[PDB]
Amino acid sequence: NSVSVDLPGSMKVLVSKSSNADGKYDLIATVDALELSGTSDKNNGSGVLEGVKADASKVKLTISDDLGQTTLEVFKSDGSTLVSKKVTSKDKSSGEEKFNEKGEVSEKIITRADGTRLEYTGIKSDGSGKAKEVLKGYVLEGTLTAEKTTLVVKEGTVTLSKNISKSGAVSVELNDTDSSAATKKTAAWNSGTSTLTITVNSKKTKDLVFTSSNTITVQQYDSNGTSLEGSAVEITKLDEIKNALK
Structure with missing residues (x-):
């Protein structure tokens, strides 16, 4: 019984x-x-x-x-x-x-409640290794150290880096090797809203939001570079991240 x-x-x-x-x-x-x-x-x-x-x-x-x-x-x-x-x-x-054999972790797969994953493989004794974040529709790839996970997307001369600190805090940065003031992208990160705002030629062009639901959305600014226009669109594939970096 x-x-x-x-x-x-x-x-x-x-x-x-x-x-x-x-x-x-x-x-x-x-x-x-x-x-x-x-x-x-x-x-x-x-x-x-x-x-x-x-x-x-x-x-x-x-x-x-x-x-x-x-x-x-x-x-x-x-x-x-x-x-x-x-x-x-x-x-x-x-x-x-x-x-x-020494009981040291060599792989760690984290599955979040929503099914997205962090896959850490080839982990060495210093806690470094390879990293992948598995989202709905796409994967982001990069590296792990004991300080942070860094996931990288490249498009043209732009490199987008999503950092997940050892504490779990997300920050995002963008670096562009384009030297032309007319076309070079720069970006600013707002930790309060988890939003990366991209600027080109001194005008805001788009907001990339890294949501608490482990998605990314993109929203454009008007040609005035100050007001958002339309509505944010959820990224569904890696190609669409690259498009946002053009």
Whole structure:
């Protein structure tokens, strides 16, 4: 008469209806094809379950006390060193890591609640590596250091750099090697509205907004260079970012 409990990370746990003589509850779960089991001092499905892979790697599922978060770990066959770790947090975002022989992270894939991703690969012991942000319709590529992620789009002599600091703060910059005052793009970043305003020949030409929904929109200014015109258009493909940089 166990009770099924729904968990973050698309998993379920069965918890015993009543406790044992020690006051503890039995837990069972099946993850992929793997049977895991454990015992808990709570009655709600939280606690620790363990099992093994067919190749003898140890597996542990840890469910936080309030059911808000789950962690699914795989270890070497003696249980000592991590091989992989997936944490699903209470917003249903996830972080999935792989580790090298010394337990150092070598890959980290972050999936946000909206499905956009940050993919960090080839991570070295200094926390540097390759980076990709996977948006709806397009990807942005660049690098990771312990200070920031920098994602880069090039168009003509313009380079657009989207920075995500180690703290998560976004900033964007634009650099153009065009020397002609008539055509050279410059830009200013407004952190309060997450907006990059591009200027050419001393007039504002467009606002690129990096939204909290992990989209980018573009809106043009009137020929006066002071009032926005029309309405902002959501970028759907990388070509449209490049178009905004022409």
